[PDB]
Design a protein around this ligand. Structure first.
Ligand code: SUZ
Length: 90
């Protein structure tokens, strides 16, 4: 079940979701949500929970990107201004 959530970065300063990259023999393990930090934008939503997979983040797609690279691009968005839309795979 793919769900897209729009986090408000006006009142929230951090998302509160530690990204965990899944590493294996191949490498396309993808990035998943580790833990949610109370006080973050994600904790204000509720649809995202530990174990959710990040697919698309503000138009950008991480499904065919490296785990590390996904976080690289993600950091550019997370350290920017504007609404952050997270597309998770539950
Ligand atoms: C909690 C958390 C957030 C969201 C937030 O709380 O605002 C986040 C955003 C990013 F763009 C990158 C990393 C993180 C993070 C925890 C963590 C995950 C991976 C790394 S390594 C893969 O660089 C380090 C730390």
């Amino acid at each position: 079940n793919i769900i897209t959530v729009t986090l408000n970065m006006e009142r929230h300063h951090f998302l509160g979701i530690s990204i965990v990259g899944q590493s294996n023999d191949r490498g396309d393990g993808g990035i998943y949500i580790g833990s949610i930090m109370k006080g973050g934008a994600v904790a204000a939503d509720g649809r995202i929970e530990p174990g959710d997979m990040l697919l698309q983040v503000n138009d950008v797609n991480f499904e065919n990107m490296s785990n590390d690279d996904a976080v690289r691009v993600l950091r550019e968005i997370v350290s920017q201004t504007g609404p952050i839309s997270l597309t998770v795979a539950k």
